[PDB]
Amino acid sequence: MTLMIRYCSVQACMTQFCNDMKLLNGIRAGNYTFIPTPKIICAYGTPEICLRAPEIRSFGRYLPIDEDEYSVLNDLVASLSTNKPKMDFVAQMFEQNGNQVHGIWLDHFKRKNDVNPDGGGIHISEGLKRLMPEYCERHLNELVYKTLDDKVIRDYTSDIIITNICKGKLSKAPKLAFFANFYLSLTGFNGVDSPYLTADEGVKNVHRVIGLSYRNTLSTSPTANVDRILRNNPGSAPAYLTGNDILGVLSDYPYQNWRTVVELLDITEPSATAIIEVATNQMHAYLADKDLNTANLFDNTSRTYDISDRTYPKFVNITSNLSNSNRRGFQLEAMKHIIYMARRGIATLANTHPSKIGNTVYYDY
Amino acid sequence: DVQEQFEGYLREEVDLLNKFEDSHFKQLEIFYTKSQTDHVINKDKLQFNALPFHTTLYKEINGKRVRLGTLLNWTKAERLDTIRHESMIKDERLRRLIDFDYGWIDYAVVLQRYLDEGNTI
Amino acid sequence: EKQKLDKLKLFETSPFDPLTIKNNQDVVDKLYATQSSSIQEVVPTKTFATELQF
Amino acid sequence: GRFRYRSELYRERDVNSSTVFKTATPGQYRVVKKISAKLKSKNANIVTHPMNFINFKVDDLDIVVNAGSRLVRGTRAKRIITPNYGTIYAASLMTVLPAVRLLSSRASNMGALSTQGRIALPHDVMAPQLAVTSSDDVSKICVAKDFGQFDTSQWGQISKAHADGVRSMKAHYSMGHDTLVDLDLNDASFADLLEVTAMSYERPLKYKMNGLVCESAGVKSGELTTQTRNTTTNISHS
Amino acid sequence: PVDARTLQSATAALAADTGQAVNRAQHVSMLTNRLTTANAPTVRAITVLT
Amino acid sequence: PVDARTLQSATAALAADTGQAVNRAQHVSMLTNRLTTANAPTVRAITVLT
Amino acid sequence: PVDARTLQSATAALAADTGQAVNRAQHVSMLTNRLTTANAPTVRAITVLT
Amino acid sequence: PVDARTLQSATAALAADTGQAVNRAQHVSMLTNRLTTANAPTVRAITVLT
Amino acid sequence: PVDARTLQSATAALAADTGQAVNRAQHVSMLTNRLTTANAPTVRAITVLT
Description:
part of a larger assembly; 9 chains; A: about 375 residues; 6 strands; RNA-directed RNA polymerase (chain A); Vp2 (chains E, F, G, H, I)
């Protein structure tokens, strides 16, 4: 992707990518080797991409793949990654070496907000029990043992993958957060010609149709926002808490009880209200990228496009009354179709309803 | 008529995906020999042995089969001497390459075809 | 060709759209199970909520 | 420790008394791997051994720390990374980190020649130059400066100037000592932390790798501090 | 024998007349959450007996 | 042939006109829960015949 | 010796009367979250001693 | 040239003065959901011409 | 030196009196959102100076 923005076209870059895929080592375990199908790219969990438009991630869902084929591919890619080996490794390290946290961090991380740990009697899930102060110590030890990296965890992961695949056990893929079919109509151009002269024709066409982005208008990940809120107000929340963990535990519970949740994580009010607001307005970003580890994804070509509030009214038409998070998620869903169409120099407007349902009836707005 | 064009483009995407997967399997058919068995993930029963050197793992769902991938069992490495082996290597230059590390064996035999084309470096 | 017609007729056979279906389902999911037993005695069940809102 | 797990994947020949054990099940074996490793990462060391980071002695300004080497794509000079010691790192987090955070933060509705404005997406960052290079107006000129081997210039006077600039903030914090003393991080007054950061800035620091030990009195390539010092020097030059 | 007609239509009207909220505790949900038709034949025979 | 406004748009307009919320059961929800346009041509023909 | 009677019956009645809502914040929550029967035997005997 | 101000500062006051619920449907949502700044320069040019 | 007492109790009292809700937009949220005690010691010094 970062190559395509500079000196490389879709034809050359895609040929290079396919040849790179063809030579990958494959999952090696014991004296057996698994080479999975190359159709895992369009599957959920991997960047779901169409070959002619590789920039748009998570676009493979809308492709007319057979439902059964797509389901089996999703289970395959879900089973290709497991978290059991790391848990087993950490558990055995704890059972063999014991506690590793200092006493200063033991006494410093204590409940201060003076709130009943039982809560309102609500169901305390596993993550909440992990992050709650009275059970902090064990959790802290896990962090230490999550630091250590060694060959054996990945050899065990490969062995588990091989056994599970061959035995017929496919992990059940998680559901998709957002999915909607958007129906397009013609419209006019909005953008300005691309300064990237060397870039491929598709990217320049997208720049001409939609426009270019800027750092002021660039969207911010919810995890980074929660991290900023936590860091700007030290002492309000325990230092070990990260934006990812709070976002996950909030995404587990219904929003109606979210406040109670932040009371059990010992989050003082200045951080609590801001975290609640961020979760309310920006849960779509976390739910969209929940199942994919985006640590190694810096989509430069996708970032150059202007997908923000400045271009939503001119290209997306949603009339239903929805919450802000769902509205933004569906706006990105429509933007995916808009970008795919605009790669070919055609500017379109997305709508949530077909123009001609029946041979006699025609719909508007 | 933009919607129909969009649907046609998605259908072309599916066709390209199928061609790309087929090309990948055909290309991997030369590094290891042609697949010897088609092992069904759920329907068939295997005890992790008596599986050939190269197998195609499929999965059956709703009266249809999909192609999960390929399994290679390195115990039955004899099949690999069908394509690459020291017997075919004859030219004195590549014997030392074979002895240095066996990993070049494949490339070595490929080079020999060039040498059997009559051209010498 | 029949599948496209069926999907299109789904839009007109009901007043909801997948966006609104997701929005409505985001409200009652996991709501009943999370609350305590006493509160569970005084709130509708998840099936009841789905029946009311759909 | 020893990490053990059950594998139904090996063969009978591979069974040896060291690693893989033939178990009761005819086809299932037990493979063990002996591990002994040090938790060298910053977070694991922070949780396990915080006294090193908290307690500070004067002698820690003289001890050596291992350096790292990073090769780059191309034929550019090899990069050497010289991390600061734990106590100095904690002091830098307390004192210098706010300046770096403020420098990194640039927001809308600000002038270009502002502290944040002066210091991703290539088009946006290079936008003024992109507009200037394509314009009928000829008064506007673009000047580009690249500074190399300025560590020798960083040695000496301007390092002390940075130290004095850091020291200038001690007048706003009451409790303080005349000279450097051993301190406790959570009990020391901010003046002592500022003074220790100034000493770390101005004093030469010793680094070792591959059996070679060297001292630096310039930028020292200390993380979280190179950008600020370099941009301040460049601003003064301009 | 009795006609097997679901109580869904009747219970929907009960929720409509007295506002029933998912996130609120009300007296109406106490009646609905304990509507069990398991012991209907026994009560039917008692009504005939009376 | 006819030209018709989207059913979802009209439902949104009516829901905004009244107080319609997904948490609490209401009568407007009962009205707007079974709006079907599937048999529109038959009713149109019946109207013309009448 | 004392009987074992669950607090769920009484708590539900309190929640119904006060209109307890999970999302909102009321004073009835400041009473239910502090309902602990841990030190009942101590207060039971202090009642007798008075 | 004009200044760049996020609409959230002004929208926060509008939400607070009225009652905005993430679940209910109101008239304030209709006004806020269609707030567009994309065509600001054209309208600004219209204002001067008038 | 100053004492360190968590303002959770004060916030809960304020929240209950105003009936603050997670899913609405009230004026109490704007007051509650920006309770920053980072700059407290400087304001404490200013108070003594007056």
